[PDB]
Symmetry: none
Amino acid sequence: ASLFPPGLHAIYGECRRLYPDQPNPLQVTAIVKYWLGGPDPLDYVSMYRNVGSPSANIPEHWHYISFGLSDLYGDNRVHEFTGTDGPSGFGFELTFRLKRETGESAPPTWPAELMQGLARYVFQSENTFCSGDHVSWHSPLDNSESRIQHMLLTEDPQMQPVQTPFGVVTFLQIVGVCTEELHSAQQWNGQGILELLRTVPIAGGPWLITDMRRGETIFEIDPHLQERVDKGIETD
Amino acid sequence: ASLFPPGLHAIYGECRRLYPDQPNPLQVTAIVKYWLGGPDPLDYVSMYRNVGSPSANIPEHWHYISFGLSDLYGDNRVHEFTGTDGPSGFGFELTFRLKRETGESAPPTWPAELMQGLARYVFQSENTFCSGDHVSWHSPLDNSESRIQHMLLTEDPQMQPVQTPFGVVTFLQIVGVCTEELHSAQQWNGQGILELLRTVPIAGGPWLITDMRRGETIFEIDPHLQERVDKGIETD
Amino acid sequence: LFPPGLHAIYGECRRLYPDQPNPLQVTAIVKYWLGGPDPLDYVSMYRNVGSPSANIPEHWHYISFGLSDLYGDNRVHEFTGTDGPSGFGFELTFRLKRETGESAPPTWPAELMQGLARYVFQSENTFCSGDHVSWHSPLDNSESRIQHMLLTEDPQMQPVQTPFGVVTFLQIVGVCTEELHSAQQWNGQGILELLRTVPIAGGPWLITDMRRGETIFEIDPHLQERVDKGIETD
Amino acid sequence: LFPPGLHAIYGECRRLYPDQPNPLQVTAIVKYWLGGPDPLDYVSMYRNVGSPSANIPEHWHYISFGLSDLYGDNRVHEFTGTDGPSGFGFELTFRLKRETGESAPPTWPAELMQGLARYVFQSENTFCSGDHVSWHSPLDNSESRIQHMLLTEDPQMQPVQTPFGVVTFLQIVGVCTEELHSAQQWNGQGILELLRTVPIAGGPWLITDMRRGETIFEIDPHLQERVDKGIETD
């Protein structure tokens, strides 16, 4: 009397189209669900292995997808049902791509935590996030010493918006960045820095993968990108 | 070398107009300031004793005021300086009024924590708060068993907006409420529930004081208020 | 109601970890009773500071949910009153030595457990303290010498009463092939006793260290005498 | 550069409380060196789990900032090299027994400390281990029988080297009037020794329990003997 949640199924469906050979991936869950009084708004976080793409500049990475920001059950236990047209719940779920480090047999679990924190902001303030937005996390994302301490949001390069009997669901991918890059996004705009990040493989690449070990800003890597920012600001 | 912060001074000035006899109140601070890498965005939280007003049926309570959401230093270490016209930093600071209980010689310190949590949301997301907004904290505010698990924001009944050399600063007072009251605010609007709360002394009264020990919703206290809520939704 | 079976187990877990109300918990994305391949619905993973006092190192503690009757509505196990055992009567647990720098418990043990639970659901025999399982493969798919298992009752998790039956806790203890053979020649309880006397191989709480490079016998060749005398006087 | 004096003390605090990097810290809204009435710039308040082993109960630990030279720029104390004492040479500390349900450390001890510090500035001068202070009032303005103080070196906080001098830590220990008198008849160190042997009155770490209703003598009338023998060999 807890069948496979329709909302969850729609997302799970997309996940399968992408990882047909990973039907039983590592999945993390809140021991006491939010709608039962728990502190974490995301009911589940699936963690897949993405081989990426040798050919392109795309390295092997871990891919995370959340469950809870959208309307999973459609019975008003967390979000209000609002037809199949509008957005399901908040309208999206968070995703994240973490560069795989040698000797990693499974995907590290800290990103679920990061997502719960972001989700917690959405649930309580009730303000949603959009592609291009930035979040001044102001702390190394994985509680390490990393220079990646903030976030930019963009649409997931592979996960496509899904139709649900409870509304549409899109996927917002988290992209870790350095404070200098965050400031740059504030001076100009998120979409601009996102474009730049795509041109610098080690900082994101086409799929905007995050490398928590990156020690340099895109600007330190290629001081010419600054020009591009200056022009953007100007012509905007 | 660290003079009395102009921004802090303007707020402090207001605090004095209100508490001329408490020049040396309990004040809490972040051991490692936010702008030095610390996790708490509020540099200080002053805690005063408000005798209230026996006459008006306004009980003795603890009054909290934050420092950090507005521009305290004006040297771009936390917020960007934007002239003396616009808002100072985020334009406001948080306040809170906690009903005084027996066994309290001094104001309890947990509310500082609550404020840091709220401020963190503002700094990270860069979305400010306004009178009438609600926050689905989804947890007893003081980590007790209290039924007060959410918040509504209204302007402080006494603290008045202050002019600063770094902008204008208003004061947003936190008002704890029950989930039923939060939903009520969502169905209708924050200002409406705030009005009601003012008419029910034990639930807030004229100055919207929070009593973490309240066991009943305003509706359970006087089932008639529901009528007002229904008329408001209708004519709105 | 929240599943009584789940409730009872969760209860024991809190008595042990009052400060970890929100531990990392792994689950089967498609539950077994919905057609999924993994019989365990959940695997909770806690941090156990151990006991500096008794030389018991900091380790990760795993507890499974699914081998016992969690829901009591015959969706997985048959309801058999509150007396007999709940479902198979137990849940699996495991203690993995923490390696410095580990911020969270590694998740591979959930897998090992699913395999075992899978084996338990399929076998025509019951599992008990003292049993050995010839896994025949490094438990974490590494190069480890720990390739088999012995089962013992969990040193801390205590049997719990449930409206659906009694639930005990069987802890997995990784061991070397030489140690498995030793258990076959003599008996599980015996090797378990020995393992308790050799901290790096288990200690009082029988914690598993996948990095262990030596058998208990290579560590102290005298234990063989006890195994021998054991077999002899037995 | 962050005030070297503060840095050094913060350093010690961390060695002791590696898991409390962001403790509750109280400050003077208008610092003393800006015209304010309170000489202490800050008072950090930590949670000390104590030691179940030695029966040292969980308590709140307070440390002051201001009696020593925090800034070294003559704004409060005179800079006197790195050899001599930093400012007055010490900072005050206090250990308050935790009462069940105290989610955070109570803040009144900061006040008590400001009073003592205010007293040290106006002179009788620096305090030393063994000194007594006839506060003559329940320390927390309650009805408590603890109305005076004895000073001893902090059992854990160790003297720190600072570019502005050496800083030691003097811990405040609350006592009853009968105990104060006893210290006057004999000596502070003596009563401090006795207090250590009576856990509820102080114990090894000399924790203060504002709820104590009995003097150490009423608890064990024999200690009186040991005070007399002290007066005698002195």
